[PDB]
Amino acid sequence: KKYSIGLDIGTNSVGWAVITDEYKVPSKKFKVLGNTDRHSIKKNLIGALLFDSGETAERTRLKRTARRRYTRRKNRICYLQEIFSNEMAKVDDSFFHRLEESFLVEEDKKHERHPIFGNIVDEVAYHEKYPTIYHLRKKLVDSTDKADLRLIYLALAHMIKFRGHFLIEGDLNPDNSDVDKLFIQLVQTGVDAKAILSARLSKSRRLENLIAQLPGEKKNGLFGNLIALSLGLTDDDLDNDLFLAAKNLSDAILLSDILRVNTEITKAPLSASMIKRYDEHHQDLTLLKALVRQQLPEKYKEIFFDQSKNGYAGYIDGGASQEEFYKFIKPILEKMDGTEELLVKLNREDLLRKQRTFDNGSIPHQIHLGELHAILRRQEDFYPFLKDNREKIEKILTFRIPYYVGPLARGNSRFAWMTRKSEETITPWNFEEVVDKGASAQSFIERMTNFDKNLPNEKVLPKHSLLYEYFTVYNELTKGTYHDLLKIIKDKDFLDNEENEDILEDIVLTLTLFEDREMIEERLKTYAHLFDDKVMKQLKRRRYTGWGRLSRQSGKTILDFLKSDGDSLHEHIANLAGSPAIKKGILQTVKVVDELVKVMGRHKPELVETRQITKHVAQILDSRMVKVITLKSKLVSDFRKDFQFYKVREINNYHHAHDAYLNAVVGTALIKKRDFATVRKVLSMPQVNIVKKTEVQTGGFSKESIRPKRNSDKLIARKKDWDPKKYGGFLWPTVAYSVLVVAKVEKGKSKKLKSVKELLGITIMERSSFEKNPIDFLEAKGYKEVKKDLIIKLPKYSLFELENGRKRMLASAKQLQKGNELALPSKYVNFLYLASHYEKLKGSPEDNEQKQLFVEQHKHYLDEIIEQISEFSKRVILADANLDKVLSAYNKHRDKPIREQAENIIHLFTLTRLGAPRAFKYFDTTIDPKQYRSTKEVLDATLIHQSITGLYETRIDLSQLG
RNA sequence: AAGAUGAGACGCGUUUUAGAGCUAGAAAUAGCAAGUUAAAAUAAGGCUAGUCCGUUAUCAACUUGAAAAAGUGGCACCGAGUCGGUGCUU
DNA sequence: TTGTACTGTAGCGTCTCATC
DNA sequence: ACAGTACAA
């Protein structure tokens, strides 16, 4: 009748248990299915469900944002092509066609292999005239001559494809900048600012830095490149030209952070500085060649030809980084003389720089706007079409999705929240007139802020909400905005006004929700007639933070008791805090509860995260048709040590199930304060139904490194048309699940229709096409007449029973895993962990040394366990000469101290432990790696379907198939 | 303090192609010159065709069910190489 | 021509917004 | 876990 459930919850495992009152796990005879001759199995009512750890959604988020990024960038290019198509179809209609076909090989291209001009001599002349695109950019900015439309489009597409960061919020012209010494303009309205930077900053540090410079009639008589005006301290206050000089000096110091020198009068200082970089690289390469030919001709072959030895050829043609190439070439220029300028340029990281470099991420989008506005102002008179819609392309650079608007979905996304005012295709030119920025912006903040735990229909209150603030002031008086909005109202009595204070809630609601100037203005529109213009243009600055955790016993409410103070099963669980791994664990635990109540005739049993877990599992008693107890590990460990069965992870998966058992034992014992003689036998049975959960593998298709072209057939076609023979592709695809098939395949030059039984490994993208039509897909892979009703679906950790109890765990269609665990007597483990790890078992009183002198007789087990590994490895691992290796290494180091050999037998049990084979050393040397590539040996085995508890099986004998 | 989700952006990398290599060469190969950039893609792709979605989560098997979802399997004892048997029961 | 033994392979770094 | 090379038939 009566029984209890033991449970533990973890990232990867859910141990489960069944205990009748005197600490005894029952043992019962069960029923199986399938075509096997077995019809009754015996298993103890104890087990552990092991599964892969849950993944966080962060990687999918970074990928999803990346996909949206590339999509919108391609759309920007598409818009610019849409603009230029009408005019440049006159000069070259296939120009965009060649641009899109530039990836293809010469035969695959539908036009000439030279994209920019479609002929060799013009393309060569262009490349000679403009060594980089930046030469074209600078030429188009500076020269007033009429340009080819094609070069204009290259400049514009390069501009918008890499349009720079948007951290700089205002408009800006680049020619305002000057050397760090520009602070002389602040003086007349020293050392560069970097000596003052990278230090402590505060209001007092600001004060002392300003006072350390010379005072005068002005705030400083000499400003000494001080901190406060150049650097923002750690439209508002516009009601207050030192400010303008401070602003311009800040623009100067930023533009010196990005750009070096801008002497020559040009509107494209970025292109100028980078052409300076290019020309320096040219001159230094020529000097390098001359010096290496003069001094060291033998390393000339290594450096300038070998792409593998991290030379300059490795730096350009190979994948060498700038830092690694610098650290390679630095000793070469150190021991060889005449390269002091080379060393000082290397120490400045300005030596042989490329154009497209990882450090370009500091440049703002206003620089590209200045260059782009400049080229349109240059070419407007030659091409009136540019003058027709100049602001459109300018907008394409400046346009951005606002961070509060979200994805521009027509109600089909699972993340989007935008609210269009019209059913129009959103363009950068008409974004704000279509999208209701108001509803979308308020939807951003409301959809993510929580409801009250007592009232789940409405949002929690702001911390500074006004009638809530008066309620909280009343609460504090019985048991800040009163002193704050006194300033804005300029009266305390009208702050104490009561009648019209619900709208007064709604202003502070607005200023707690929104941050944007125009948005606060548009939502403050409602209160225009109550106040004058100056006071509400000052009031819109009152940005609020914080949300209060509330809503708007003998019959007492929570407030009255405070006067004497002293649904979806998925979504109710998934919404909690904590890692996604423990959420997967508790979902498995809920399924464990459902199965454990299903099995026994529907008989019910008798930190902050698990506090939530206890309530959510106690909800079951009235939601889904069991006293939920908060256990502690202390008495569990005390019972383990006192009754001489110590907790161990290194041997086997076994003690997680014994921990679930002892969890139920301690819970029943504390609700209750023979069985003490029962517990040591209960941990002593070697049959516990351990269930490795079986999952289809989801994730990326492959390792992401696109491997170069090859003649192999295992390259993955990264596009449909892109044949991976020529274009390169991915390797190491990830298996989804194995599919056992029985069919016939023709083999040999004289082909014969020979029957076959083998398992194919499906992968993630063809999983959809496989499940759409398995027979036609399997036909396409080559199999004739696959037996449709015998297609068996075999995901990872599918389990197979072979002869003499040997079990193997399916890793993939080309790889197995070990499926068996050994089980020592408990006295062996007691001897081991009293010998091994003194420092983390001892420190308890002298009974620890008493049980040490109970296990001193067990030194013979340092041989006997080697006999156990030999026996079990010959039985179910079949390790062949590796057994000879470990036995030999054992035999030469038996005479070592007990502690260290005990630790090293702990190190050997990585052989016998469940799952993958892994190397180990014992004392001396590493065992060579092994892999069970043979999936052949399970084709005649007995397949095991194991339930979530594993209690309910369906065994299939594969040899009876086909 | 300690971390979880979602939105907007940037810059590299990778791959293929374009950037005419020259001389001595039957040739094998040797000497020499050049090298900095661009285009396209960045999960195959999907249809509700959106400037949206595609790596998070769910999932033993079987019978129903497009799916969702529901259903499908005895007890007592003694032993224990991973569970075995006995007897009762219909 | 089809299976085993052995060693080698693996996309990445910033920035801005909101809360539990 | 899968690849690539190097051998046993």
UniProtKB/Swiss-Prot annotation:
Binding note for cofactor: Endonuclease activity on target dsDNA requires Mg(2+). The RuvC-like nuclease domain should have 2 divalent cations, while the HNH domain should have 1. Crystals are often soaked in MgCl(2) or MnCl(2+).
Residue span of region RuvC-II: 567-606
Record-listed Mn(2+) 3 binding positions: 893, 924
Regulation: Only has nuclease activity when bound to both gRNAs (crRNA plus tracrRNA), which results in conformational changes in the protein and formation of a central channel which binds target DNA. Also requires interaction with PAM to trigger catalytic activity. Nuclease activity is inhibited by EDTA.
Annotated source species: Streptococcus pyogenes serotype M1
UniProt-listed GO biological process terms: defense response to virus; maintenance of CRISPR repeat elements
Identification of the protein by name: CRISPR-associated endonuclease Cas9/Csn1
Subunit-level organization: Monomer. Binds crRNA and tracrRNA.
Consequence the record notes for mutating residue 656 to A: Only cleaves 1 DNA strand, probably the noncomplementary strand
A GO MF term: RNA binding
Substitution effect: residue 68 to A: No DNA cleavage
Stretch forming the signal peptide: none
EC number(s) given by UniProt: 3.1.-.-
UniProt binding sites for Mn(2+) 2: 8, 656
Effect of residue 13 to A: Decreased DNA cleavage
Disruption phenotype: Loss of correct processing of pre-crRNA and tracrRNA. Loss of immunity against a plasmid with homology to CRISPR spacer sequences.
Chain residue ranges for the region called Recognition lobe: 54-567
One Pfam match: HNH_4
Cofactor(s) required for function per UniProt: Mg(2+)
Region RuvC-I: start-end pairs: 1-60
PROSITE patterns in alphabetical order: HNH_CAS9
Family: Belongs to the CRISPR-associated protein Cas9 family. Subtype II-A subfamily.
UniProt note: domains: Has 2 endonuclease domains. The discontinuous RuvC-like domain (approximately residues 1-62, 718-765 and 925-1102) recognizes and cleaves the target DNA noncomplementary to crRNA while the HNH nuclease domain (residues 810-872) cleaves the target DNA complementary to crRNA. Has a bilobed architecture with a recognition lobe (REC, residues 60-718) and a discontinuous nuclease lobe (NUC, residues 1-59 and 719-1368). The crRNA-target DNA lies in a channel between the 2 lobes. Binding of sgRNA induces large conformational changes further enhanced by target DNA binding. REC recognizes and binds differing regions of an artificial sgRNA in a sequence-independent manner. Deletions of parts of this lobe abolish nuclease activity.
Record keywords, A-Z: Antiviral defense, DNA-binding, Endonuclease, Exonuclease, Hydrolase, Magnesium, Manganese, Metal-binding, Nuclease, RNA-binding
Biotech and industrial use: Coexpression of Cas9 with an artificial single guide RNA (sgRNA) which fuses the crRNA with the tracrRNA in human cells has shown it is possible to target and modify DNA sequences of interest. Cas9 plus the 2 sgRNAs have also been expressed individually in human and mouse cells to achieve DNA targeting; cleavage efficiencies of the artificial sgRNA were lower that those for systems with the 2 sgRNAs expressed separately. Microinjection of Cas9-encoding mRNA and a synthetic sgRNA into zebrafish embryos induces targeted mutations.
Residues reported to bind Mn(2+) 1: 8
